[PDB]
């Protein structure tokens, strides 16, 4: 598509959290909506700033909602005066999931940026996923004969920081972040987190299938198509060729691990030699 990856800077996250908190101080709200400013680098979005805009909606009806687009334009001008290279690239809202009226809001935003990106930023501290979920509006051409509609195609979202922004984040995360853990422990923790995320995704798919089976949701006929491919992609690890290749590869890596460990042991013995010699010299001169 027109968007390959959306990089959301920590300043955007902090601004969104602050906007949500200051609006929610009123004690009666569900979500807040603002505008996202960034630059364009190849096909990778670089969402780097944001500003709040007045917004309200009805709890029952989805067609009733007000967004101050004049406020949008005025603050776009004010921000453009400060930073001309940051242009409107989309919008954000803090609702935990999508809304039925999100397509209308994206249509409103598309005038200012034709390829607008909606970045749902969950203020609640989710334990596994990233707080950002990026979507772009696409015209879904169905093959069932149903008329073409506008949907939100998901986009891989990442959190990246500028050099000074990273410096500030590390200053704010100085105490909390533990960097003493070695690289190997970090990779193993990454594997654990990947297992947890895969379990969560599979549980979401299972819950959707459970709802479909009991009739809570209709058969999409497109999620089923994707799920058949997913189950077909499950490799057979019991094949003789695969097992032999896996064993050969594991032995090829284990011989390297053995060589590295042997060299490490010899170097450790050399260190012990140096320590003992230094201790004996220190006690001999004293």
């Amino acid at each position: 598509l027109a968007v390959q990856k959306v990089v959301v800077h920590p300043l955007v996250l902090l601004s969104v959290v602050d906007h949500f908190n200051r609006i929610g101080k009123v004690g009666n709200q569900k979500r807040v909506v603002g505008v996202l400013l960034g630059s364009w680098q190849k096909k990778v979005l670089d969402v780097s700033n944001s500003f709040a805009v007045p917004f309200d909606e009805d709890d029952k009806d989805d067609s009733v909602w007000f967004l101050d687009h004049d406020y949008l334009e005025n603050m776009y001008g004010m921000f453009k005066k400060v930073n001309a290279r940051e242009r409107i690239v989309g919008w954000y809202h803090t609702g935990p999931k999508l809304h039925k009226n999100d397509i209308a809001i994206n249509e409103l935003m598309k005038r200012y940026c034709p390829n607008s990106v909606l970045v749902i930023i969950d203020v609640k501290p989710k334990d596994l996923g990233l707080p950002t979920e990026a979507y772009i509006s696409v015209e879904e051409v169905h093959d069932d004969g149903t008329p073409t509609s506008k949907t939100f195609e998901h986009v891989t979202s990442e959190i990246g920081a500028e050099e000074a922004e990273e410096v500030g984040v590390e200053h704010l995360l100085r105490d909390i972040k533990d960097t003493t853990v070695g690289t190997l422990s970090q990779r193993i923790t990454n594997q654990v987190h990947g297992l947890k995320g895969l379990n969560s995704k599979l549980l979401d798919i299972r819950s959707y299938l459970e709802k479909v089976a009991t009739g809570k949701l209709p058969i999409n006929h497109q999620i089923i198509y994707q799920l058949q491919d997913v189950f077909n992609l499950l490799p057979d690890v019991s094949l003789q060729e695969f097992v032999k290749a896996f064993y050969l590869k594991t032995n090829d890596q284990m011989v390297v691990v053995y060589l590295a460990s042997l060299i490490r042991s010899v170097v450790a013995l050399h260190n012990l030699i140096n320590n003992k010699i230094a201790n004996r010299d220190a006690e001999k001169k004293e």
């Binding site: 920590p10 300043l11 996250l13 902090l14 959290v17 602050d18 906007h19 200051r22 709040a52 101050d68 005025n74 400060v82 203020v123 501290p125 990233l130 707080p131 891989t156 959190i159 990246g160 920081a161 500028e162 000074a164 990273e166 410096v167 500030g168 984040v169 590390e170 200053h171 704010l172 995360l173 909390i176 972040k177 190997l184 990779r187 193993i188 990454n190 594997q191 987190h193 990947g194 297992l195 947890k196 895969l198 995704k201 499950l234 490799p235 057979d236 690890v237 019991s238 896996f246 594991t250 284990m254 390297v256 691990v257 060589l259 590295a260 460990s261 060299i263 490490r264 170097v267 050399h270």
Partner: protein, 290 residues
């Protein structure tokens, strides 16, 4: 009613990130902006947020505050739940430390005329490194009071003398024309958790296996490197056998250390191969056809 040295300026995480980004973007201009917050009491100056003022034109210095832009930004921010008064101004010092020049003193005099407890914050985005940002808060010392023989502020605690002033700031008029207010940071659990997502790798790449062709090529290359490294390591051991203690480090200058490179290669290969093996073993269980 002398100001107390125990006064503190509380900068929020959003405010700090905004000033750091604006100062780095405006290098080497002394880009300025306004700090919205609240004077909680005589000892606290909370800085809830900041907003950057646009630069009129070229020049590495603080320009005059545009009243129209400030009024428009304040009025519009009040429309979206930001009814916080201006508690002072911030401006960037790209690499020459945190202090106030004559132009900065004249600019801060305006805020002090408006609000007597306004604070001039200086952030050094160039000298700031990860985990330690170079920042300071200042307020002018009135010449009339100090000349007659009065301390600029009263010391009722140790809180105002915990940070030793830098010599660069002292040269540029610190404790003579302006005084430094201790800066503390307000961090909540929510914002810290939100910032923790920075560089947080996706769950997909946790189970993602590296290409086995490139992995084998890397293993072979590093092992071939350790071959020469051990060949040199033997010579290094023999040389250090007969080498005087003054040359233990001087003779290591400019010459590669086979032991250090051997350790680095061992660590790299151990990590890479162990991670790849563990990931493959996990994938053989998770993604199975049965």
């Amino acid at each position: 009613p002398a100001v107390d040295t125990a006064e503190q300026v509380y900068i929020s995480s959003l405010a700090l990130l905004k000033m750091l980004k604006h100062g780095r973007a405006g290098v080497p201009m002394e880009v300025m902006g306004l700090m919205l917050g609240e004077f909680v009491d005589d000892y606290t100056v909370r800085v809830i947020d900041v907003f950057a003022m646009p630069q009129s034109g070229t020049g590495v210095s603080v320009e005059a505050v545009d009243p129209v832009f400030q009024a428009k930004m304040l009025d519009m921010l009040k429309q979206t739940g930001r009814p916080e008064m201006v508690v002072g101004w911030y401006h960037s010092h790209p690499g020459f430390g945190c202090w106030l020049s004559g132009v900065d003193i004249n600019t801060q005099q305006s805020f002090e005329a408006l609000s007597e407890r306004a604070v001039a914050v200086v952030v050094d985005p160039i000298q700031s490194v990860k985990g330690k940002v170079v920042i300071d808060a200042f307020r002018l010392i009135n010449a009339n009071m100090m000349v007659l023989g009065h301390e600029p502020r009263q010391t009722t605690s140790n809180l105002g003398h915990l940070n030793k002033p830098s010599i660069q700031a002292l040269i540029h008029g610190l404790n003579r024309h302006y005084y430094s207010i201790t800066i503390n940071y307000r961090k909540n659990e929510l914002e810290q958790k939100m910032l923790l997502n920075l560089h947080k790798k996706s769950w997909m790449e946790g189970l993602t296996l590296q290409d086995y062709s490139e992995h084998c090529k890397h293993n072979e290359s590093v092992v071939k490197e350790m071959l020469e490294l051990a060949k040199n390591y033997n010579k290094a051991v023999e040389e250090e056998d007969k080498m005087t203690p003054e040359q233990l480090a001087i003779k290591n200058v400019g010459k590669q250390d086979p032991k250090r490179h051997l350790e680095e290669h061992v660590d790299v290969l151990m990590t890479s191969n162990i991670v790849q093996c563990l990931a493959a073993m996990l994938d053989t269980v998770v993604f199975k056809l049965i």
